[PDB]
Each structure stands twice: as C-alpha cells, then as structure tokens.
Amino acid sequence: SWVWNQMFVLEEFSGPEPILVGRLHTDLDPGKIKYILSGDGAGTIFQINDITGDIHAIKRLDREEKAEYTLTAQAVDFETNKPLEPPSEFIIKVQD
Amino acid sequence: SWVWNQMFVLEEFSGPEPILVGRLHTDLDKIKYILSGDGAGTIFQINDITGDIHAIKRLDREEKAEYTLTAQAVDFETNKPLEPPSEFIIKVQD
C-alpha cells in the first residue's frame, strides 16, 4: 500500500526553460513502447517525449493558481497503437 | 506494469539549502516513515511524520548517478511494520 504515482516540481525553478519532472516507464520488455500523456496541462504545461518517457515542465508554475495536476499515463505499440499498459492516473504536485 | 517507485532530483538546484525530492506515503489511516540505504540521513533526509525526503547536500551525478533506498512504515508506539519494507530509487539529473 505504498503510494508511488506522484511527482513533485519545484515552482521556483520552473519557467520557459524545461525542467525534468519525472518519467513514464514500464517494466515491459523488447520484442518499442510509445509513451502517451493526457489530462491536466498535458502538452501545454507538461511535455512528454514519446520515446524516452521524460516529462518536462515547460511553463512557469504557480501553486496558488493550481497546486496538483492529475495526469494519465498511456503506453502503446508504435505500429498498431494497441495498449501495452492500462491507462493510469498519476499526480504532479507543485512545490512550496 | 507501470514503474512509479523512482524519484528524480536535479543536481543543479541541490546544495546546502534543502530541496524536496519526493515523499514516502502509504494509503493507510499514526504512520512513522523510516528511510534507510544509499545516503539516507547524510545526503537524503526524511521527516518521519510527513514522509518528505529532502536532498541536503550538493549532488554530483558523476560521483553517484542513482541511489537505491528502502522505504519503511511503522507504528509510532510498537514500531512494528505497517507496510513491507520496499525499495525505491532516487535518480540524479544531468
């Protein structure tokens, strides 16, 4: 019952310069995973790379405006777009 | 399955002033959070009440890129485990 699916971003260090928040990652193996990000500020505030799974904040964050972002993680096969993981919620929580 | 038990810390923002890394949390309803392993206490410091992990030294990814730690949750009175002891990883920047 450990809860691991949250990430924290320090608002002070956020801005137009992208800052690494976390990474989507599956323990699933070879045989390539495409990482898809949706929900609360996906694309605009938080940007994913579909290959690496890296999530960067690409905007200044303001905890007083919004303190928590609920996002959905997805993983699909590059060729067929068939799911390789269940769509799964995780939370990005903003700093101070 | 999704792997969530990793926390990333940016080396550039580390130093003598503590920066928040992440937080140990159990979905139980009281809980004492205990941290052990790679740099527990010296580099990474936990608040046993809130579960907050701070980095309290300048990190250096060239020296050590990755820290394997153990999360524990115990009862304040009896110190018996409320969760099984679980590994997690703090990864440092670039």
Measured on CA atoms in the order B66, B1, B82, B18, is the torsion positive or negative?
A: positive
For residue B8, which phi and psi values (nearest 5 degrees)? -105, 140
User: Total structural domains in chain B?
Assistant: 1
Give CA–CA dist B60/B14, Å, rounded.
Answer: 9
DSSP symbol at B13: G
Q: Could you tell me the CATH number of the domain that includes residue B33?
A: 2.60.40.60
What is the domain extent for residue A83?
5-96
Edge-to-edge strand ranges of the sheet holding A19-23: A19-23, A54-57, A46-48
A6 interaction partners in chain B (CB closer than 8 Å)? 22-23, 25
Of B7, B13, B88, which is closest to A13 when you measure between CB atoms?
Answer: B13
Distance CA A15, CA B16 (A): 23
Kindly determine whether residue B2 and residue A6, on different chains, have CB atoms separated by under 8 Å.
no
Closest partner CB to B4 (pick from A4, A20, A21): A4
What DSSP designation does B51 have?
A: -
What residue type is assigned to position A31 of the chain?
A: G
In terms of C-beta distances under 8 Å and separation of at least 24 residues, what long-range contacts does A82-91 make, across chains too?
A84/A26, A84/A28, A84/A33, A85/A26, A85/A28, A85/B1, A85/B2, A88/A5, A88/B2, A89/A5, A89/A39, A90/A5, A90/A6, A90/A7, A90/B4, A91/A5, A91/A6, A91/A7
| Method of structure determination | X-ray
Tokens of A9: 């971003």
**HEC string of chain A?**
CECCCEEEECHHHCCCCCEEEEECCECCCCCCEEEEEEECCECCCEEECCCCCEEEECCCCCCCCCCEEEEEEEEEECCCCCECCCCEEEEEEECC
- Those residues of chain B whose CB sits closer than 8 Å to some CB in chain A are 1-8, 10, 13, 19-28, 71, 73, 83, 86, 88, 93
d(CA B65, CA A69): 28
Spatial contact of A34 and A75, defined as CB atoms under 8 Å apart: yes
Residues of B in contact with A85 (CB under 8 A): 1-2
Give Cα A67 distance to the centre of its chain.
Answer: 15
